[PDB]
Design a protein around this ligand. Sequence first.
Ligand SMILES: Nc1ncnc2c1ncn2[C@@H]1O[C@H](COP(=O)(O)OP(=O)(O)OP(=O)(O)O)[C@@H](O)[C@H]1O
Ligand SMILES: Nc1ncnc2c1ncn2[C@@H]1O[C@H](COP(=O)(O)OP(=O)(O)OP(=O)(O)O)[C@@H](O)[C@H]1O
Ligand SMILES: Nc1ncnc2c1ncn2[C@@H]1O[C@H](COP(=O)(O)OP(=O)(O)OP(=O)(O)O)[C@@H](O)[C@H]1O
Lengths: 209, 220, 286, 353, 50, 145, 152
Amino acid sequence: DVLPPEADSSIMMLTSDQKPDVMYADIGGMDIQKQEVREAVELPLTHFELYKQIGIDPPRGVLMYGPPGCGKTMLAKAVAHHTTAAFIRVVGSEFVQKYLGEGPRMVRDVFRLAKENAPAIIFIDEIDAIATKRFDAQTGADREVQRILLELLNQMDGFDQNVNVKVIMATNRADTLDPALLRPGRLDRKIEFPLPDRRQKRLIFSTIT
Amino acid sequence: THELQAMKDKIKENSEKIKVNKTLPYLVSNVIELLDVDPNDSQRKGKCAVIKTSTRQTYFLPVIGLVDAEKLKPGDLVGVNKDSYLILETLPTEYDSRVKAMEVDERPTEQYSDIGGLDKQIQELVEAIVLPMNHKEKFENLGIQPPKGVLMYGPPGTGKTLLARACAAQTKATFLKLAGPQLVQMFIGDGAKLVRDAFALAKEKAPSIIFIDELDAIGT
Amino acid sequence: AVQKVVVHPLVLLSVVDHFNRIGKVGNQKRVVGVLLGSWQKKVLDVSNSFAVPFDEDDKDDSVWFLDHDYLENMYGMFKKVNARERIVGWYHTGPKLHKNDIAINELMKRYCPNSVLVIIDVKPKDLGLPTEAYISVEEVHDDGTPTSKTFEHVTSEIGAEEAEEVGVEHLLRDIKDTTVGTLSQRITNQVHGLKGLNSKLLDIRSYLEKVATGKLPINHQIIYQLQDVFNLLPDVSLQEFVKAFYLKTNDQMVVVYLASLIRSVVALHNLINNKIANRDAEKKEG
Amino acid sequence: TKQYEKSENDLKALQSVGQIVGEVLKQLTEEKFIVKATNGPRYVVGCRRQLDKSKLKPGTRVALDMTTLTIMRYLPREVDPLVYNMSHEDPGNVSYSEIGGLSEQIRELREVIELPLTNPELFQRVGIIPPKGCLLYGPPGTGKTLLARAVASQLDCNFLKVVSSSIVDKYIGESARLIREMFNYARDHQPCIIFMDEIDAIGGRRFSEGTSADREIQRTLMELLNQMDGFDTLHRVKMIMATNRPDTLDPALLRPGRLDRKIHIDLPNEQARLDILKIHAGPITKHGEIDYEAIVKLSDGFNGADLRNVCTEAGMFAIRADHDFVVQEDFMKAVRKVADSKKLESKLDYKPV
Amino acid sequence: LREELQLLQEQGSYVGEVVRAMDKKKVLVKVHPEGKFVVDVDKNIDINDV
Amino acid sequence: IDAFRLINANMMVLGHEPRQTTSNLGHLNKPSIQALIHGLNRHYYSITINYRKNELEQKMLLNLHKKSWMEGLTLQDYVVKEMLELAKNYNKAVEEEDKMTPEQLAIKNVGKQDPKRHLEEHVDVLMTSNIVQCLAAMLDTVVFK
Amino acid sequence: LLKLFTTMELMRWSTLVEDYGMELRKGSLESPATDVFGSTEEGEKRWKDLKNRVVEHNIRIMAKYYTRITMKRMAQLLDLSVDESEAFLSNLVVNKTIFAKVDRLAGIINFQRPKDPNNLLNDWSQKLNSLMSLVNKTTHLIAKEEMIHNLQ
Ligand SMILES: Nc1ncnc2c1ncn2[C@@H]1O[C@H](COP(=O)(O)OP(=O)(O)OP(=O)(O)O)[C@@H](O)[C@H]1O
Ligand SMILES: Nc1ncnc2c1ncn2[C@@H]1O[C@H](COP(=O)(O)OP(=O)(O)OP(=O)(O)O)[C@@H](O)[C@H]1O
Ligand SMILES: Nc1ncnc2c1ncn2[C@@H]1O[C@H](COP(=O)(O)OP(=O)(O)OP(=O)(O)O)[C@@H](O)[C@H]1O
């Protein structure tokens, strides 16, 4: 007999729903960012009957880059206070372990919770660690985890089209990323976090006061 | 009161069963201090500890049995015999392999009298090493700390290799040969294991003399 | 102290196979041996044991001899093979104990603080779960007697263990197992009335016997005190169920509904799928 | 003499074979419990009747049997670097105020550390976030290891020490779980204090990645970067770091958050050097005629380790004259000469190699 | 199946990988976690069939 | 269990094939118990094991085991209605998922691989489920009057 | 003071005024009667609260004994008016310390139990409790049979 299956010993998932994390009142991207996030992030949650009418694919792809400012995880915590959702809080380098056999189970169980149940937004911070491509065999533990990143890169193609999944992603270095990552057909939406400059000063000074 | 001998025979035959527990372990363990008492659910009380292995496994056995938990802070190199999983005695000395003893040296042939013109600058090296030996009792009175690190450099040949080695015969302390490349190994973090390994033998072997050569290379 | 004990069929046969020893060679008394117990908790458990030569005269009904040289060295033989196993007391096959058993228990109290004797039965007859368990304490008495040592009955239950069911449960082979859900509960219903109402009739006849003779037992008071706990409802004619009547069928409410509802769907699974599959093969064969 | 029979019977219980330990993962049912041994195989096994409901636990270490792999007793899980971390020691107390400068760094390090412990009310009532970290770097003077470790050793059982040699660990070793453990126990003992010294080697940048060994440094980094800037609350626990130069710290560590307060050490000053000489003259005997301004003026731009050890070098020159109480004239000789010799040895400051 | 399970019971039936065939009647067999082992006849699969 | 006996290796000059009475020899040779056991048939030979009658104690061995295994007194066991709410979940929630397959039997028709029999085993489970609850409801009318 | 707390039951409220009305004259130390019964505005609040303590300590034990009661019986037990009963039933019910169903048309009021929707509980309480004692009969009845037969 097999498992239900379940998430096994990987991750471990959930732990976001304990609450609270970060209130969106600080920066929610009112009327500007909440628009692009509306259609391309929280609408894909279900919105099943609307997508068949337009015929345009709302891809899972959400890219973030260029800190400062931070943004990133805060945007994952901002949507957490908008709608109740189970978030995957992980890092690029944390799942590297002494066993590479668990790898095929990880991306399966991480992405199986998006398709079956969809109050789900998966966030991975600083993927440029595993995005580094190392040739040597003694480094195969690193070579296996970027296959893990490429395996979930294949599983996102098994989702489309279409229902259902959402994946948000953030990294501080876009040069080490593999060309297949940002290649069209997988991530079709890239939202560059703008440099705060002068406009966010009075905004961050208003929320601090 | 004559039951002693018949009772003394079974402790030797059980020790004979310890003598077959003497020969022979294929397993060496690392120790972890633990205190565990489980209420049920009449009462079972005691103490247990955690046991590692050299094969990367980590086992579970009650507190030894023989040597008690009074000694010591968690160590390694404790004999565990086959499937019995009982530690009869905790065996020295420290660890590990060739990191333990780098090289055992006795005395140099040459002497400090083979040099000239360095007389004033060689004494600065001769002082710092000789003064803690005899004058340590005089330092405790005046509250003086003896020097430890000393640098010897010059355009080669300066004779520093044999001269600093010839100073080990005058100090009577044991000499241990060491070098910069000697602290380098194939794996990672091995240098941190070697230096902590020598000072562990240094504290046990009483004040001694350890000489290294070309520290600026590894010190770049 | 000792609340309940657990007796395995393995140690029980160790009393039975010794009945084949003294049975063929004779002569008097019974099977008596020293019991090896295992205490992991307040509940007592017994795994193995060893039978010792024993004799008890009739005349001289109080004469008994344990063999301590067989009790000492063989313990070390068993202590070497099994460390946790130790002697918890003695045993015998009874069927009925004699007053001399106060000396057998008090002599072995130097080995163990409290020795628990186990009365067993070599030939099962009546009335129920076999053997017996007794614990040795001192309750004195209410009448003013000197301090009295009387073995109190201990509830005994059989139990199993891993690797010991290999040959045991294989040799029988004649039992139908279990079968839970059909004959298992209904057989006991005929037994719980049989065994329940015969000990009832047996005890109420003894309660009437107490009026004629046999007083004391007064008891006292456990006879009527525990009887009145049975008397929370008697039940007497008729059943005094006027409050429990409309509740009675109310317990049959869900049972009958789940019956008729599921059986109708089970019929829909039985009738439909059968006629389909049967009409398939029947008419397409010829 | 029955103690021998008691001792041997206890050794008979030692004939019981030892079991193996593992980590619980999840539970499928009551008769099957997922358990991961320290070796990494995962088994679903039954259980015996002597255990309780506290045996299950949310992913806690248990002891599996060697036959049926059943659990006997549960124990708290630790990899135990921490007992090695608590093996340090240091006098003071007193060494807090012995350095003498800078007076603003003496008073501030006493606030940011001790005030959150005694008075959390100021943070919750005013509604401000207390600093969860600090940075002390060198060597423009001394006091890094002296002032911080003094409060550490005085805080007794509550402290955490980290040596730069434990990050590299061993070949194919995992320090990523150490970084998560170091901050995990930092959230247990409160307020915890962590010291990281000489991070130039283990703070490796990902700009130039050498061999196979630079990435495992980046993994320990990203583990530090995640929990310090978390998303996991460090607010109560204080952290300290130390480095020679903040060149390789990258914009991640140079940022606030993970490294909050960076206090640069300042060299002893003629006013402050007068105080540090008072504490140096305590252990060493001197002649009845002594002038503290003489030693302070003759030695300028010297670290506390330079002043102390050369003042002991003056005592070693004082024992060369065999005199017990010695005038400062023989001191000023050995103090000025030996120190001026130290200045022509090491190049810095100011010129780099 | 119970009789078939017995053949698969003791150590379990593994899956080998043949890296090369030898003229000595022994066939190299590689297990995925382990190294490369070797085994002889094996009369069911002929040498030239390997 | 197991049984074996060492045959003399010096017998190699003589014949290796006793004994007579091939009945228990052929039955002992089967199942042949894997391979390495028959690989150890070199220098060894097995031996048959039968049970002389213990039926005196073997009659009580079945009696003592089942008497203590039936409700402990056979009385004491007479999870009940709470298991029926769990049963009617297995009599309903499990029913609709098992009765979608007869709709999958109609293709229609016929593009899917046939035949497939979805009748068992849950139908007989629902049979015993109501047999349990009806004879468990009889406990009311059995113990009482 | 402790007798009212242990075993509860009832008492005549004037007898409590007899004991605690003499504590003003008691003493030696008059301070306990000063801060409590010496203040006019504070004491009257504690006097009505003393009425709330004696009525609520009765409602708690009555919630265990009900079942049901008549409204007219509650007034004579609480030693106060039927209108004061509705007042003491109003302030205690908003504290939700005891669930109650108050029907003032027929005078029948009851503290809990919520309509008794359960069924299996009556089947579980009856069968388990009673019948296990019925099957425990044979357990110790044959044991008591052994006790009496070992002597007479
Ligand atoms: N309204 C706001 N605008 C900008 N930044 C904010 C705001 N509110 C909080 N922050 C900052 O966000 C930080 C935490 O956010 P987050 O966890 O996303 O950081 P991060 O992106 O992981 O940092 P890094 O970019 O260094 O990896 C806090 O330290 C806080 O200073
Ligand atoms: N000033 C000197 N006095 C006496 N002997 C000398 C002197 N300089 C060199 N020698 C001799 O020359 C030999 C060669 O040693 P060398 O001087 O090359 O080593 P070194 O330069 O001191 O090594 P390192 O620089 O690594 O310490 C030595 O055996 C030493 O006895
Ligand atoms: N002002 C001082 N008073 C007493 N002891 C000092 C002083 N300064 C340094 N020391 C000694 O020097 C050792 C190192 O101290 P610290 O880490 O503060 O300086 P440092 O970083 O070693 O300086 P540098 O890097 O220039 O050697 C300490 O063990 C301490 O005993």
